[PDB]
């Protein structure tokens, strides 16, 4: 009788093991789902990273010095340059570097300077410190 008892106990143990295996499989599936979610999150953030690093480099750089504009000035022809850069240019030529229209007016642009400071503030401390150095150097 302890015979059938031991066999019955063994069968129960086997059933428990099977249940544990099923639980492990479920856990593995959950882990896979979590990994997929993480990948999706990375893709969402990766696009933002791509935008950030095609934001602050392709449209805010002076064509004369290849730096983010320092003391941005906008000409009558609507093109902008660093104040320092365009003044040096104008000692030699009175045509817009970009469109070559005769320069008739300059104005500083608070909005461009403020936008650039905010953008640069999100870049590496190397980029931020370089900008600080040029600002003082051209001061």
């Amino acid at each position: 009788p302890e015979f059938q008892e031991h066999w019955a106990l063994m069968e129960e143990l086997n059933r428990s093991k099977k249940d544990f295996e099923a639980i492990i499989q479920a856990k593995n599936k959950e882990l896979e789902q979590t990994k997929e979610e993480k990948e999706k999150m990375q893709a969402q953030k990766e696009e933002v990273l791509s935008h950030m690093n095609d934001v602050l480099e392709n449209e805010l750089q002076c064509i004369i010095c290849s730096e983010y504009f320092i003391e941005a000035v906008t000409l009558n022809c609507a093109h902008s340059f660093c104040s320092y850069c365009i003044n040096e240019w104008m000692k030699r030529k009175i045509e817009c570097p970009i469109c070559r229209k005769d320069i008739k007016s300059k104005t500083y642009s608070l909005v461009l300077d403020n936008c650039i400071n905010k953008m640069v503030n999100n870049l590496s401390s190397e980029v931020k410190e370089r900008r600080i150095v040029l600002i003082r150097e051209r001061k």
Binding site: A78, I98, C99
Partner: protein, 71 residues
């Protein structure tokens, strides 16, 4: 169809165009994006300038050709 233009600073812009569009027409679209008047734009494809009266079809410019802009 879309084509690319490599601007003065070496950046790329995309234009929405047709094969029938004239070069003047393409220059008008470039002015809107770059602020460079048509008469100051010289557009180059395959090493040669594109003349104002001609169309994109005439220069075998196609889907995703790149035009180069100089002064």
């Amino acid at each position: 169809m879309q084509i690319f233009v490599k601007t003065l600073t070496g950046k790329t812009i995309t234009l929405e165009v047709e094969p029938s569009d004239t070069i003047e027409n393409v220059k008008a679209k470039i002015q809107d994006k770059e602020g460079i008047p048509p008469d100051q734009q010289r557009l180059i494809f395959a090493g040669k300038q594109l003349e104002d009266g001609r169309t994109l079809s005439d220069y075998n410019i196609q889907k995703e050709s790149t035009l180069h802009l100089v002064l």
